[PDB]
């Protein structure tokens, strides 16, 4: 599913991400925009044998199990395919475990590169939340 901006902002809010680990809602909308372009099916294989899955591009080495990545940890205890669902519940739950791991949202390279320290509230502007 490709979410619209406000459509995603509303779903992410429903899912309790607003100020989750101190990160305002815009941070999470901004991270999805630059990780997946709001596409829940987004799948990207890395040269290292790992793959990134879903709206927040969660990685198969430590976080989800895709059956094909050596040194699998599956810390979220879900298969990677669950992160490709029209329903963002599995990605949100796994993202909340990731953002609690000790590095905050620096776990997302798109967030670091495009979002961190910017006017992230712009990502939820015009929505009626």
């Amino acid at each position: 599913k490709v979410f619209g901006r406000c459509e995603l902002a509303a779903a992410m809010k429903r899912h309790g991400l607003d100020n989750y680990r101190g990160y305002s809602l815009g941070n999470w909308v901004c991270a999805a925009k630059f990780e997946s372009n709001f596409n829940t099916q987004a799948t990207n294989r890395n040269t290292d044998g790992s793959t990134d899955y879903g709206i927040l591009q969660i990685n198969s080495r430590w976080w989800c199990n895709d059956g094909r990545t050596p040194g699998s940890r599956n810390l979220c205890n879900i298969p990677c395919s669950a992160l490709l669902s029209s329903d963002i519940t599995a990605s949100v739950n796994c993202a909340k475990k990731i953002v609690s791991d000790g590095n905050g949202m620096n776990a997302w390279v798109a967030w670091r590169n495009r979002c961190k320290g910017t006017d992230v509230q712009a990502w939820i502007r015009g929505c009626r939340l």
């Binding site: 969660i58 990731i98 791991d101 000790g102 590095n103 620096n106 997302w108 390279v109 961190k116 320290g117």
Partner: protein, 113 residues
Amino acid sequence: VSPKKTHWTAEITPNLHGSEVVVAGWVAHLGDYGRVKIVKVSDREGGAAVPVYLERGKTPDHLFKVFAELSREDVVVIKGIVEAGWPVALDTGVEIFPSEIWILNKAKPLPID
């Protein structure tokens, strides 16, 4: 041929931005997130845990292979450049981008099971 430590982890401050440092201590924390992997180094008990960022697109490929052999409490020597440009101040204050990661000894950790 591992380099001599130049700084204590608590001496890694924004003033060092753009310079090369060598830190030596144990692995306090590891986070593998795919394109970003972070190893935090401590050398003083209850002290700083300075974060060493490996970022795909920035960090040489071979260091990601070294990161893969790392465990908590491993003793390491890491050579890197300090980055403290805003927005680093929003959280960590400093980041170290490594050019060398050396493992002096692997910890014999005993699994709990």
